[PDB]
């Protein structure tokens, strides 16, 4: 399986972290940094943030069916809007690809890890 079992591993670990996103400083900051760096969000796509109890699309509060602000296009001269990701999951990618990163983080992280291995050895 090689790559495929790797995708399974990564998706499983980041879904687990998302489900406990607000209990883990380590994972919280890890996910925040990864998303802000690779301009990505989640596993297969940003929809994964729906499995967090606060961001589920049938949740009561306003964090429902939205995505944490680290998935917005942070590389702008603008200041941080915490609510930039709200109410974006029920809508299909191209509506919000101007507002948030839509690709998942698994694939982007793995393609970077591959193409930047020439320096990793020696």
């Amino acid at each position: 399986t090689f790559r495929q079992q790797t995708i399974d591993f990564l998706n499983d670990n980041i879904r687990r972290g998302i489900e406990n996103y607000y209990d883990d400083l380590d994972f919280k900051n890890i996910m925040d940094f990864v998303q802000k760096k690779f301009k990505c969000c989640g596993g297969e796509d940003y929809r994964d943030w729906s499995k967090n109890q606060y961001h589920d699309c049938s949740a009561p509060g306003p964090l429902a069916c939205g995505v944490p602000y680290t998935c917005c296009i942070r590389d702008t001269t603008e200041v941080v809007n915490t609510m930039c990701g709200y109410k974006t999951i029920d809508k299909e990618r191209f509506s919000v690809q101007d507002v948030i990163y839509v690709r998942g983080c698994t694939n982007a992280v793995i393609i970077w890890f591959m193409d930047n291995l020439e320096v990793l050895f020696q």
Partner: antibody
Amino acid sequence: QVHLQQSGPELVKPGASVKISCKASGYTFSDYYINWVRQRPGQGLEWIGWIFPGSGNTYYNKEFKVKATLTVDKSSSTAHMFLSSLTSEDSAVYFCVRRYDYDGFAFWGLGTLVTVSA
Amino acid sequence: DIQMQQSPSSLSASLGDTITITCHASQNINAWLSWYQQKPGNIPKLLIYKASNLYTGVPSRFSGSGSGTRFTLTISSLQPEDIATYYCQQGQSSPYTFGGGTKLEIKR
């Protein structure tokens, strides 16, 4: 060639159940949502709920959560809406729709007419 | 919890004239809003998406704009084939809701 074909019109006795099927074509099925909308014969459009095939997640309007259940079969590239405990009011036309790459509902099904009648 | 209200319950005006329909929201929905047209004896077609933009294939005489709470769809140089019933929906927060439906009649 983005098209949605629904089931043929259905007739059911009161209290029975119906399975409406919606086959999609022209686009990657798993990537886009499917919405369902019901129009009673003499009224406007009324919103059932949404379902995303790639994850299987579902959201319902509160009114229809009891009476309807939404499913998908990715291999068929088809969505289904199952209605149960049908009332004399539930006789209506049901549409399955796929929205445009931007927010609007671009592609509407022709409509499946379900008549609850003895 | 987000209910739509359409202003002209039934509105008839003459050809060539400019008419306007209003769609008021219960809560701020920013720009997430859509307009559809339903010719009688026909399935609905998409008319306007995202408040301002027009869906492909719509004649340019249709225009729409507004802000969060209140929106307007305006038809200039009205034509007979535009006899239909017109609807608006919101999409910001699920569950999506529709409008009351506004009937359009020509005066001839």
